[PDB]
Amino acid sequence: TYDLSIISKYLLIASYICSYLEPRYDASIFSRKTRIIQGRAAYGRRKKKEVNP
Amino acid sequence: PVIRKFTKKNVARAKKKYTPFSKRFKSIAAIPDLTSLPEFYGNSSELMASRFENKLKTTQKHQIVETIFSKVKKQLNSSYYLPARENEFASIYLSAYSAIESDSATTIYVAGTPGVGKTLTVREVVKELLSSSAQREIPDFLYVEINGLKMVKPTDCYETLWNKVSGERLTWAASMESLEFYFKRVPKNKKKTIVVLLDELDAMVTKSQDIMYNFFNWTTYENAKLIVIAVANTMDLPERQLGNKITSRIGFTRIMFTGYTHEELKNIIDLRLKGLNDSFFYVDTKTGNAILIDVRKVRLRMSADAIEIASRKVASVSGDARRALKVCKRAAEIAEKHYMAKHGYGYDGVQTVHITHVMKALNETLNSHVITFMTRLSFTAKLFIYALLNLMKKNGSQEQELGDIVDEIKLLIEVNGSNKFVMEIAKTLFQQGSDNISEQLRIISWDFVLNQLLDAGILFKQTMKNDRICCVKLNISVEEAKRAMNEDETLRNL
Amino acid sequence: LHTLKLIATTMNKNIDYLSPKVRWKVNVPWEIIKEISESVHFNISDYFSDIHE
Amino acid sequence: FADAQRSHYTVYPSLPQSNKNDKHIPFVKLLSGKESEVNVEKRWELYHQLHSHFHDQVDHIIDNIEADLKAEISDLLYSETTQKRRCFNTIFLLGSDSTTKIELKDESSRYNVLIELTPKESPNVRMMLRRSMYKLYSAADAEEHNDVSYDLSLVENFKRLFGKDLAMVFNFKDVDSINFNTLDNFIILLKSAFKYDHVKISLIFNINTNLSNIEKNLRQSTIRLLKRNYHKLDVSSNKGFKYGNQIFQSFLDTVDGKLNLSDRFVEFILSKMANNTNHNLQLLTKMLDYSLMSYFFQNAFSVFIDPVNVDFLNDDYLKILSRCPTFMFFVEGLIKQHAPADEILSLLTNKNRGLEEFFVEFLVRENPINGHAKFVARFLEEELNITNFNLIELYHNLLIGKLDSYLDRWSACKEYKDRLHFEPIDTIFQELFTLDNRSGLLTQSIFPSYKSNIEDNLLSWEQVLPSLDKENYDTLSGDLDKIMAPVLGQLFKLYREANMTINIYDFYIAFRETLPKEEILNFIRKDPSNTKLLELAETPDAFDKVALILFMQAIFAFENMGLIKFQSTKSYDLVEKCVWRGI
DNA sequence: TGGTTTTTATATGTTTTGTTATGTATTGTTTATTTTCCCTT
DNA sequence: AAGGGAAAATAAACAATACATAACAAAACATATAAAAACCA
């Protein structure tokens, strides 16, 4: 559909994630790196929403 | 030529010069004596102002009938010695007699609520001291009417004052430099004293307040011989517009005219009736024409308690002399049309104006008509108000959604289906009478009566294109809307 | 991506990019960002499958 | 009234009398001041004849990308003789920058006006029409050699006032920036001019992105009007690579036989040109120029690409070329093959004549990859009718030796993959005449990690300010400089280790504990001259006041850099952090 | 001096642009209650 | 391996702030004509 750049194309994808996922749940989805220092990761959404944002 | 981006084909420009008065004599010592100079101070302008009397003249006149009450209405006009402003005459006349006699300059500020005799008595001040100047006990002066609401632009007062002083037509930016050079630089031996009346000073100062400063600052000059009688409405108009340090520098007098009392209204109305009250006319019985001293010798007295209650009611509200002279003029033509209907004169023992003629003349300007208007609307228009009043007692929100009004009208015909009037009208209000028209969402003439109440001013409606969520206020009151709907027979039972 | 009207802002005349108050949002439909995600072999539907679909 | 407090003042600066020299070129003496002045001015003019020979062809190329595009749009704008004759021919220019002029025909007994509309010229529908009717009435009086209301009644009176029929062309410039409510209502407005029998409208849409984005914006009954005759013309500098292949071939013609291109450089060119798809050719030219600017500024051996300067060769040149890594591999090969020491010693610096006679041998080789890549690109063009290929990654895979592993994707070069085969050989001294980025200059000057260079200077700061040892014990604050950070660098590590929302007062106290209490008050007293400053230092409250003054100009400097939000105006007690390192 | 042309002052109209007020929608803040897995045992 | 229990999540009422647009102001852009002012002659 578009002739956008390869990083313009991932920057609309990240724009579509930021604008429909909520900011509260982002640490549960995207975090991958091991913890040197003790801490608890985000638990995620507990129940699904039936609005389809 | 070039291709223009837009056109102005109705420009009409005045033949007004651009150079001010400070650049046509090259020296203050070369300025001549301006009083003994032909085009200054209006010595040739008395020909063109009298041109327009001949335009409205026609030679036909066929014996117009002048009855008893026509002479009273002619004498109660506002255009026709004044009793109740004596200390205010003696304050304006004393302040202006001293400044003309001493070749000085001052400003007199006079305010008050509308209609209290202040434009009348300032003109009566300057007419007294024209007669004093014509007898040579004060020097000659020149008098300029400036009315702020008789101007198109606020800046036209500079043009009209400098035109009356000098006979020259300049633009306004050239007229204020012409006037400012005139008042501070031209010597006092060469000028004449000028009494300018800045009437209705509210209207000139609404946008930029640059105009009230100049006329008052010109009076502080030594060489200026300028008396500004500035008549406005409120008393704080100098201190709000100019400030506190400017209005203390000018040092003007400050008069307020209080509205008249009821005993002062009686000595205005009965003062304009001294030649006609308790007097004899000659009325012929076949045309109706009266002649002051086939024909009866009728006479005319007006009741003194009729003038009393016309004075007690007008002075208690505003106190102006116009509303009392035209509540007695209105009473004099109510009494005429009954005299005109009994005898049938038309147009070609004792007469009186009762207490009931003055009360009838006074009640019609104090009554409201939103009661009488809404009792005689349609059933559809009264059903719109009656549904709106039910919504303002379910919520009290006092602006109802217009789709909540539509569902209320439908619910009110829903519930009252046993009613004798509602069974026979609901056929003629959803299908409009006959078959072949479907049952519909709005009642018949819903767009007619919603626009009828918005045009009348009863109803306020906000601007939304969604015709259902739009909001609707009243503009009259909730009480006088309920008073009009508890009178109608069919709505108060349901 | 903002001059192409693919990222939107709050509408004020002469917004400044360089300000704390200015927030951003995407304006492309789902049917465009689905065509975008299959080009870079990114599975954006799994980020939205777990919220309601 | 200082000039520092004004906006936009003009200095007419004073120039000195004469600085005794014709040294006014920006090139410096290399080899740490061992290079002669005649080498510096030779390297200057040998730069400008290799720079101007590149831009005389690139300006020739860019003038062909418009002369082709004017003619390709004009074959397609004219002669589509429709028999229905009650619509407009629409030209969608896919991916076109709105910087192409359109020449219309002269074509007498007909007026051909071009009406161009930018989205700034289109706030609403009546402003699109009053500019369109002004642009045709002004351009018809220009060809003509009374006033008219500028509306679409000028279109019906056009034969009754000018005698010739009309053919107006609309050129919408940034149609991805216009709003589509206005452009929909203006096409519907122009639809009302199809009853006049002497006009024809032609729309041209410079759609920078996409056609699929446009048909979701217009209403459906307008697209049915735009489809009676439309033509999609793909307009890009990046289509088929045919103009990027000409600028890169024009570069390789200038540096043919005199400069080499490392594959670490070519794939950097290839990667950064993929991150910008709309404006490639200016960015392709920008990277080839700045690397060519970088070569002649930094290499003293830049004067040794024309053979007339080889007769100059000096001793410090002989000490610096022998550390070339291919040259050590050549001496290593002479160790391992030929046992005796003397022929290797005649190669090295103990024979003063032999090494400079060894370098004159290897300058004249053609180094034939530059002509062979032009040979492959022409042969793979006309034989196989292949259009869609980079010459840039063809040159990149040719440097490696992966040529036939790149040609197998077209599946039609199997009968020709043996005759086009070429293994490159490493010539000697090719590191001294080459373009490479192993230092990281092009991705620091042209494509810098902007914000990451800001947080690294804030956080680390030892790479920025010189830590000097002798001069500090003389100066006023050098006892303080070894124990105290600069305040923007000290406050940033307190900024970095903190959470999102931070109280200013707790952030003030945490800053204050990092500072040395005794040596700040010793530094504030070491000036004896300011009486007013020594009076602050006698107070018991001196360190607590100096720390706050020094805090709140750095908490101020972090706001207009954009690192700190003041959350919740009316409160002014706590701040939110904007910027994280590493992102 | 004298007519003629050119510029200026005064006057109004047109289009773009930037500011502010406000009603409604969004977002943060606090308190009670429930689920999840890290860190001690 | 079990389990405590604190972090994280949910919900709901309420307060505080942002946002979209209405209404308008003002500057840029534009034209017109009578009066000044050069200016040939």
Ligand SMILES: Nc1ncnc2c1ncn2[C@@H]1O[C@H](COP(=O)(O)OP(=O)(O)OP(O)(O)=S)[C@@H](O)[C@H]1O
């Ligand atoms: N004391 C009075 N004696 C006799 N007639 C009077 C008296 N006061 C007012 N009138 C009459 O009523 C009219 C009212 O005129 P004014 O009251 O002077 O106007 P006004 O005071 O300027 O009210 P404005 O214009 O609204 S501020 C006069 O023209 C007279 O006819």
Ligand SMILES: [Mg+2]
């Ligand atoms: Mg009056």
